[PDB]
């Protein structure tokens, strides 16, 4: 309902009706896309250490 | 300190009280559904099948038909049926049309775009007035243009002079220019619009000029207002080059804003805060006084100014009362207020390496060496010959 | 110390919950415009909604072949016919038509084009300014009277001399010269209509959409009698070419071109004056500047000392001033500059007096305002 | 398609352009436009005639010396020249005389010039 909804929240819709399905937190952003290429940053301090 | 505590006690009994009141008050049982409401309701569901595909009302012809463009390339010669008055509708209004057959079922839009919401940033200024350690003299030039007609219209009216249009803030970063901007904003409690000028630099066709028009509309609607065109020079004198598709856009955006800043006449009820680093060595694009009036150059902090800023910071520190405050500020040449801010932050960081929770008497005399040396390197002044 | 830390922690939670509770307040109550007696309208409206005659899909005749060949806006062509009875003589190339969703027949011819309506919003009628309170005694003020008023008031003299009636004036001057101010004053006095066009606003482009608007607006003018068409800021878009660039652009050459050809060669006019506002003639394409487009050019000349005392006096009247104040002395100290610079000096003199806590501005105030503005301009 | 000897004679083509250096390169290949005509600067003779065309419209004033006007002007094309003509008559409209004088005209050149008319000078 209108209560739950928040401004600027991305939403799913069913068919050509456009009834609300689910809210999507889900957002396409370039920073997120850059992280996926990047993955979990490796590695221990000591190796760098000198 | 204490002054702040006194306020907490009141704020926490206001919220509580309100929240409880609210249940009843909103309704929860009140449930207006008497004849006036019921009418509206019944009708609205019947007429409106949904979804409803919005239009823009291009013209009226008096015979309760209108010509609208829908989002579809075919436009549609529509009936006006039901709800919204014919008079109330003036051309250029955005309108709700019914999906089965396109008919004017009302308006609730008023050319609502997401762009206006984004810009709209009245939200809690982080600054109150004179939390800042800045000097009375600099702020009481901005205040004179912006505050003084709203608080005392008597003097301006009596003189007969027009209220000023705009100021330009330029310094010198680390004079707390944007701090100054949100000090002013708090006092006026005006609708405080903000837009950054780089959002008006795009390869996209003609979008810059469209955005420029929006800004004047927004301010007027939500008047009295302050419009912060922050980095005005992004559009203007500052560059994004023209061997990048910029031989189209940048020209059109610069001209467009320029043309609306003069207008058919100065509005004289929309205040502007124009930010730019300085337009001394840059080209000027802020087109003469009377549309920007008083222009404000913030001094580079002198010895007495930084005393006041310094006093804020020393309060939290313990063992800086034995340290003589006066001698730290003097010994350093006259430099940014940012550099005293930098020093306080470094000072604490440095105490921790010595292993003392808050600064030692020694730590403060030491702090000055690291910050002065770093900053003088960063920014080198002409050497006397 | 510590028991008063936890007073801050509590405070914060509360303030946040109150803000969300606003949504709950607004409630679910729905009500729409149409008060007093326009909800009783809605009862009629219901049966006609179910009724069918609305919408009509809108298309445009592109050729009449004695049925008609219509072209829709989605771009798709049909041969159609008359509906109830639609006279042949009503449907013309460019004329819009109302046709049914899917039975595809003309009901009503509709007036040609939807594009005038869009651009008629920009258009402003005969602005009014009083020529007497027009600052300066400028030479420029006088040559405007020759161009605009004299052919409208007395076309006889022009015929007799066997000169062409002047119709074109090009206004250019530094900003604050008063280009907009003087054009509004002569619009009023001559009692001729006015058409506001702003060329900076043109952005609707599909390779030559900007050219459609410009032809229609200029044509609107011809239809009108005793009128002014004032194209504002044609420094860019219908001003400078952007061909010069590496990748370059020519949507601006379309708009520019169209205007040149309407001006150049035979083409009727209904006493159309052409006013052009460029900040600098330099930016203006040379094609336009050189003659056979706009007849006259005047370089604005910054107001004389007599004209600068004159603007100051206009301001000083609005002000509360000292008796025996030397307007002329203030003016002489001041640079030879626009009416603008002079407007600003009176603005700051007012304010320093207010600060100093005076209601009547002294001579001395305007000595201060002057010192302020000189320095500003210089430093840049 | 005009090439041949039958197609050239019926269908004829004129074309107008200002800058000639911005064209398509396949146009400078072959004889796409079979004749290229550069306009020369106007001469004295050319100026003196164009003035006459404009002046006929106006009242004939034999005080006009077409020769004197033409000698001081250098490189005024047809449109430029008509600007001069209209100006001499505009002074005379203010004056009230239907007559235009040769004097009005010599002054009237210098508004069409870059310079404003009779610019102030220290000696005279
Ligand atoms: N003749 C004058 N008398 C008094 N003030 C003047 C005069 N002319 C112009 N000004 C002042 O200059 C400012 C702008 O005038 P106006 O809007 O006509 O400018 P413009 O030269 O057309 O500029 P733009 O380049 O912005 O299109 C105003 O503050 C106005 O009061
Ligand atoms: Mg800042
Ligand atoms: Mg203007």
Farthest CA pair distance, chain C: 100
A39 touches chain C (CB under 8 A): no
Cα B184 to Cα B200: distance, rounded to the nearest angstrom: 26
In angstroms, the separation between the Cα of residue C246 and the nearest Cα of chain D is 14
b/e per residue C295-313 (b: at least 16 CB within 10 A): bbbbebebbeeebbbbbbe
- Say which of C31, C237, C249 has its CB closest to residue B247: C249
Sign of the CA dihedral with C49 first, then C54, C57, and C58 last: negative
Which 21-60 residues of chain C touch chain B by CB within 8 A? 21, 24-25, 27, 29-34, 38-39, 41-42, 45-46, 48-49, 52-59
What element of type H or E holds B176? none
My answer on whether omega of the bond before B224 falls inside 30° of 0, hence cis, is yes
Nearest to B296 by CA among B174, B167, B136, B140: B167
Phi and psi for C322 in degrees, rounded to 5? -65, 150
Cβ contact A18–B51 (<8 Å) = yes
Q: Which of C91, D41, C65, C32 is nearest to B47 (CA)?
A: C32
Q: Do the chains contact at B155 and C359, CB–CB below 8 Å?
A: yes
Residue C153 tokens, joined: 């008031």
Residue C183 Cα, ligand 3 centroid: separation in angstroms?
10
Experimental method: cryo-EM
CB C192 within 8 A of CB C184: no
Sign of CA dihedral C333, C335, C337, C343: negative
Cα(C174) to ligand 1 centroid in Å equals 10
B133 marked among binding-site residues: no
Beta carbons within 10 angstroms of residue C374's beta carbon:
15
Tell me the CA–centroid distance for residue B325 and ligand 2, in Å: 28
Say which ligand is closest to the CA of B255: 1
Look up tokens 């705009």; give the residue. Answer: B166
CA distance C90 to C78: 18
Report the DSSP pairing between strands C56-63 and B76-80: antiparallel
**Which residue in the block uniquely carries the two structure tokens 């006095």?**
C189
**Minimal CA–CA distance to B188: which of B293, B273, B119?**
B273
Q: How would you class C102 by CB atoms within 10 Å of its CB: exposed for 0-12, middle for 13-18, buried for 19 or more? A: exposed
In sign, the C-alpha dihedral spanning B44, B48, B52, B53 is negative
How many helices (DSSP H) and strands (DSSP E) are in chain B? 12, 10
B262 lines ligand 1 (CB under 6 A): yes
Q: Which chains touch C (3 or more CB pairs under 8 A)?
A: A, B, D
How far away, in angstroms, is C241 Cα from ligand 1 center?
Answer: 28
* Contacts with C97 from chain B: Cβ below 8 Å: none
Residues 6+ apart with CB under 8 A from B25: none
Pairing, β B76-80 against β B65-69: antiparallel
SS3 for chain A is CCCCCCCCCEEEEECCCCEEEEEECCCCCHHHHHHHHHCCCCCCHHHHCC
User: Would the CB atoms of C348 and B293 count as touching at under 8 Å?
Assistant: yes
H runs (alpha helix) in chain B: 2-26, 35-47, 114-119, 136-151, 153-159, 177-188, 207-221, 246-262, 303-313, 326-331, 338-354, 363-378
Q: How far apart are CA C91 and CA C4, in angstroms?
A: 84
Report how far ligand 3's centroid is from the alpha carbon of B41 (Å).
51
The full 3-state SS of C128-184, as one line of letters, equals CCCHHHCCCCCHHHHHHHHHHHHHHHCCHHHHHHCCCCCCEEEEECCCCCCHHHHHH
Give the residue from D94, D83, D76, D75 showing the smallest Cα distance to D54: D83
Q: Which residue has the tokens 């062509």?
A: C77
- Which bin fits D38, alpha (ψ -120 to 50), beta or left (φ > 0)? beta
Query: Would you state the structure tokens that stand for residue C271, as one six-digit string?
Result: 């006493």
Residue B236's CB: how many other CB atoms inside 10 A? Answer: 24
Residues of C in contact with A2 (CB under 8 A): 23, 28
Residue in C176, C126, C169 with CA at minimum distance from that of residue B265? C176
Q: What are phi and psi of C5, to 5 degrees?
A: -65, -35
Q: Does B26 contact A at CB distance below 8 Å?
A: no
| Distance separating alpha carbons of residues A2 and C302, to the nearest angstrom | 61
CA A15 to chain centre: 24
Cβ(C198) – ligand 1 distance below 6 Å: no
| Distance, CA of C296 to CA of C166 (rounded, Å) | 8
State how far the Cα of D84 lies from the Cα of D111, in Å rounded to an integer. Answer: 8
Structure tokens at C23: 């949504």
Question: What long-range pairs does C69-77 form, CB within 8 A, spacing at least 24?
Answer: C70/C97, C70/C99, C72/B73, C72/B74, C73/B73, C73/B74, C73/B75, C74/B72, C74/B73, C74/B74, C75/B73
B130: CA distance to ligand 2 center in Å?
17
> Does D59 touch chain C if contact means CB atoms closer than 8 Å?
yes
Phi and psi, residue C362, nearest 5°: -90, 170
Is the beta carbon of C279 within 6 A of some atom in ligand 1? yes
C-alpha distances in angstroms, B175 versus B180, B296, B325, B358, D100?
9, 12, 21, 27, 68
Q: List the one residue out of B357, B269, C146 whose CA is nearest residue D95.
A: C146
Sign of CA dihedral A33, A35, A40, A42: positive
Contact C249, C242 (CB under 8 A): yes
Q: Which of C187, C181, C171, C176 is nearest to C300 (CA)?
A: C171
Distance from CA of B33 to the nearest CA of C (A): 10
Q: Return the structure tokens found at C21.
A: 């509770």
Nearest Cα neighbor of C114 from B47, B58, B317 is B58
Token pair of B157 as six digits: 């009216």
C174 labelled ligand-binding? yes
Work out the angle between the directed axes of helices D102-112 and D78-95 (0-180°, nearest 10). Answer: 130
Q: What is the DSSP string of C209-238?
A: HHHHHHHHHHHHHHHSSSEEEEEE-TTBTT
Closest to B370 (Cα-Cα) out of B338, B336, B339, B335: B339
Is B281 annotated to bind ligand?
no
Ligand 1 within 6 A of CB of C183: no
Interface test with C, best of A3, A4, A5, A6 (most C CBs within 10 A): A3
**CA atoms of C174 and C182, how far apart (whole Å):** 14
* Ligand 1 center–CA C196 separation, angstroms: 18
The region that residue B72 occupies, defined by phi over 0 for left and psi between -120 and 50 for alpha, beta otherwise, is beta
Residue bearing the CA closest to ligand 1, atom 5: C339
Task: Bin B83: left if φ > 0, else alpha if -120 < ψ < 50, else beta.
Answer: left
d(CA C253, CA C256): 5
A17 touches chain B (CB under 8 A): yes
Q: How many CB atoms lie within 10 A of CB A36?
A: 7
Contacting chains of A (3 CB pairs or more, <8 Å) are B, C
**Cβ contact B337:B301 at 8 Å:** yes
Q: Tokens 């006007």 map to which residue?
A: D69
Query: Within an 8 Å CB–CB cutoff, is residue B117 touching chain A?
Result: yes
Contact C46 B47 (CB under 8 A): yes
Q: With contacts defined as CB-CB under 8 Å, which chain D residues touch C166? A: 86, 90
Please tell me the distance from the alpha carbon of residue C229 to that of residue C272, in angstroms, as a whole number. Answer: 7
Contact C201, B216 (CB under 8 A): no
Distances (CA, A) of D87 to C264, C338, D103, D108, D117: 20, 27, 12, 5, 11
* Angle in degrees, CA C235, C241, C246, rounded to 5: 130
Cα(A23)–Cα(A29) distance, integer angstroms: 17
Sign, CA dihedral B358-B361-B363-B369, equals positive
| 3-state DSSP assignment of residue C84 | coil
Q: Do C163 and D57 touch (CB under 8 A)?
A: yes
Q: Is the CB of C182 under 6 A from ligand 1?
A: no
Give yes or no for a contact between C34 and B84, defined as CB atoms under 8 angstroms apart.
yes
How many other C-beta atoms lie within 10 A of the C-beta of residue B76? Answer: 22
Distance, in Å, from the CA atom of C314 to the CA atom of C135, rounded to the nearest integer, reads 7
Q: What is the distance between the alpha carbons of residues B84 and B103, in angstroms, rounded to a whole number?
A: 11
Residues of D in contact with C292 (CB under 8 A): 79, 82
Sequence length of chain D is 124
Close Cβ partners of D45 (under 8 Å, ≥ 6 residues apart):
none
φ/ψ of C279, rounded to 5, equals: -70, -35
- Residue B92 gets which letter from DSSP? T
Q: Which two tokens stand for residue C140?
A: 């420029």
CA C97, C100, C106, C108 dihedral sign is: negative
CB pair distance less than 8 Å for B74 and C376: no
H or E stretch covering A27:
none
Tell the residue nearest (CA) to atom 16 of ligand 1.
C178
In the three-class reduction of DSSP (H, G, I as helix; E, B as strand; rest coil), residue C19 is classed as: helix
Resolution in A: 7.7
Q: Tell me the C-alpha distance between C139 and C173, whole Å.
A: 13
- CA atoms of B219 and B121, how far apart (whole Å): 12
- Disruptive mutation site among A1, A2, A5, A6 for chain C (greatest number of C CBs within 10 Å): A2
Closest CA to D79 of C285, C291, C267: C291
Whether the bond into D22 is cis, omega within 30 of 0: no
Q: Which residue's alpha carbon is at the smallest distance from atom 1 of ligand 1?
A: C135
B60 SS3 class: strand
- What is d(CA B185, CA D116) in angstroms, rounded to the nearest whole number? 50
Residue in the block written with tokens 């006279």: C87
How many CB atoms sit inside 10 A of residue B361's CB? Answer: 12
- Taken as a whole, chain C contains a residue count of 380
For ligand 1, pick from C181, C299, C313, C348 the residue to mutate: most ligand atoms within 8 Å of CB: C181
Cβ-contact B247, C252 below 8 angstroms: no
**C278 Cβ closer than 6 Å to some ligand 1 atom:** no
**Whether residue C298 has its Cβ less than 6 Å from ligand 1:** no
Q: Which among C168, C223, C228, C242 is positioned nearest to C197, based on CA atoms?
A: C228
Q: What are phi and psi of A38, to 5 degrees?
A: -70, -40
The residues facing C372 across adjacent strands are: none
Residues of chain A neighbouring B51 (CB-CB closer than 8 A) = 17-18
Block residue for tokens 């250029």: B92
The SS3 call for residue B283 is coil
């Amino acid at each position: 309902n209108v209560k739950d909804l928040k401004a600027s929240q991305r939403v799913c819709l069913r068919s050509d009706s456009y009834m609300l399905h689910k809210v999507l937190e889900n957002k396409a952003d370039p920073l997120v896309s850059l992280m996926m290429v990047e993955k979990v940053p490796d590695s221990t301090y000591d190796m760098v250490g000198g | 300190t204490r002054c702040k505590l006194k306020l907490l006690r009141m704020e926490r009994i206001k919220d509580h009280l309100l929240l409880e009141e609210e249940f009843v008050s909103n309704s929860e049982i009140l449930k207006p559904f008497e004849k006036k409401q019921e009418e509206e309701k019944k009708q609205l569901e019947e007429i409106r099948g949904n979804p409803l595909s919005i239009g823009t009302l291009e013209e009226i012809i008096d015979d309760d038909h209108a010509i609208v463009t829908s989002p579809t390339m075919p436009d549609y010669y529509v009936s006006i049926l039901s709800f919204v008055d014919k008079e109330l509708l003036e051309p250029g209004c955005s309108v709700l049309l019914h999906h089965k057959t396109m008919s004017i079922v009302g308006v609730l839009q008023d050319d609502a775009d997401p762009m206006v919401s984004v810009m709209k940033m009245d939200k809690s200024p982080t600054e109150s007035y004179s939390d800042i350690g800045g000097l009375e003299s600099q702020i009481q030039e901005i205040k004179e243009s912006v505050e003084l007609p709203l608080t005392h219209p008597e003097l301006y009216e009596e003189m007969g002079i027009k209220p000023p249009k705009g100021v330009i803030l330029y310094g010198a970063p680390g004079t707390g220019k944007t701090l100054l901007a949100k000090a002013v904003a708090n006092q006026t409690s005006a609708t405080f619009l903000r837009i950054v000028g780089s959002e008006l630099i795009q390869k996209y066709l003609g979008d810059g000029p469209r955005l420029c028009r929006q800004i004047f509309k927004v301010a007027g609607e939500n008047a009295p207002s302050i419009v912060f065109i922050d980095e005005i020079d992004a559009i203007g004198t500052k560059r994004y080059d023209s061997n990048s598709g910029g031989e189209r856009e940048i020209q059109r955006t610069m001209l467009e804003l320029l043309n609306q800043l003069d207008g058919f006449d100065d509005r004289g009820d929309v205040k502007v805060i124009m930010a730019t680093n300085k337009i001394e060595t840059l080209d000027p694009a802020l087109i003469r006084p009377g549309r920007i009036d008083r222009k404000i150059l913030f001094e580079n902090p002198d010895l007495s100014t930084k005393k006041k800023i310094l006093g804020i910071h020393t309060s939290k520190m313990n063992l800086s009362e034995d340290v003589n405050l006066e001698t730290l500020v003097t010994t350093k040449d006259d430099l940014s207020g940012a550099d005293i801010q930098a020093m306080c932050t470094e000072a604490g960081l440095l105490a921790l390496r010595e292993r003392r929770m808050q600064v030692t008497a020694e730590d403060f005399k030491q702090a000055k060496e690291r910050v002065m040396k770093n900053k003088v390197e960063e920014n080198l002044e002409g050497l006397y010959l | 110390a510590a028991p008063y830390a936890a007073k801050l922690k509590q405070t914060e939670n509360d303030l946040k919950d109150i803000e969300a509770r606003i949504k709950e307040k607004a409630g679910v109550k729905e009500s729409d415009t149409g008060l007093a007696p326009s909800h009783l309208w809605d009862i009629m409206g219901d049966r006609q909604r179910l009724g069918e005659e609305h919408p009509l899909q809108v298309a445009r005749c592109t050729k009449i072949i004695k049925k008609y060949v219509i072209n829709l806006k989605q771009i798709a062509k049909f041969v159609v016919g008359l509906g109830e009875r639609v006279s042949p003589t009503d449907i013309e190339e460019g004329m819009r038509v109302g046709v049914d969703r899917s039975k595809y027949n003309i009901e009503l011819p509709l007036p040609p084009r939807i594009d005038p309506s869009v651009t008629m919003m920009t258009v402003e009628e005969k602005p009014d300014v009083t020529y007497s309170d027009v600052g300066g005694c400028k030479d420029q003020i006088e040559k405007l009277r020759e161009v605009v008023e004299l052919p409208l008031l007395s076309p006889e003299r022009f015929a007799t001399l066997g000169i062409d009636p002047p119709k074109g004036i090009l206004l250019y001057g530094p900003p604050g010269t008063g280009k907009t101010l003087c054009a509004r004053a002569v619009a009023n006095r001559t009692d001729a209509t006015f058409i506001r066009v702003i060329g900076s606003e043109l952005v609707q482009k599909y390779v030559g959409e900007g050219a459609r608007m410009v032809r229609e607006l200029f044509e609107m003018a011809r239809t009108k009698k005793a009128c002014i068409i004032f194209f504002d800021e044609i420094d860019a878009v219908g001003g400078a070419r952007f061909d010069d660039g590496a990748g370059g652009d020519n949507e601006v050459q379309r708009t520019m071109l169209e205007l040149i050809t309407q001006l150049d060669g035979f083409d009727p006019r209904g006493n159309i004056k052409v006013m052009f506002a460029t900040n600098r003639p330099n930016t203006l394409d040379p094609a336009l500047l050189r003659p056979g487009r706009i007849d006259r050019k005047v370089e604005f000349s910054l107001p004389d000392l007599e004209g600068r005392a004159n603007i100051f006096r206009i301001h000083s009247k609005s002000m509360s001033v000292e008796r025996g104040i030397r307007w002329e002395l203030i003016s002489r100290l001041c640079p030879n500059s626009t009416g603008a610079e002079l407007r600003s000096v009176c603005t700051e003199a007012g304010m320093f007096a207010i600060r100093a806590r005076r209601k009547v501005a002294t001579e001395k105030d305007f000595l201060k305002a002057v010192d302020k503005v000189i320095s500003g301009y210089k430093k840049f | 398609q005009l090439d041949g000897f039958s197609s050239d004679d019926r269908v004829k083509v004129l074309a107008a352009t200002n800058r000639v250096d911005v064209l398509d390169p396949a146009l400078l290949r072959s004889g796409r436009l079979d004749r290229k005509i550069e306009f020369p600067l106007p001469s004295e003779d050319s100026r003196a005639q164009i003035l006459q065309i404009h002046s006929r419209k106006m009242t004939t004033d034999d005080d006009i010396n077409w020769q004197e006007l033409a000698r001081s002007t250098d490189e005024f094309n047809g449109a430029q020249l008509k600007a001069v003509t209209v100006e001499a008559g505009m002074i005379a409209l203010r004056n009230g005389q239907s007559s235009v004088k040769h004097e009005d005209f010599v002054e009237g050149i210098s508004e069409v010039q870059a310079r404003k008319s009779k610019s102030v000078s220290f000696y005279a």
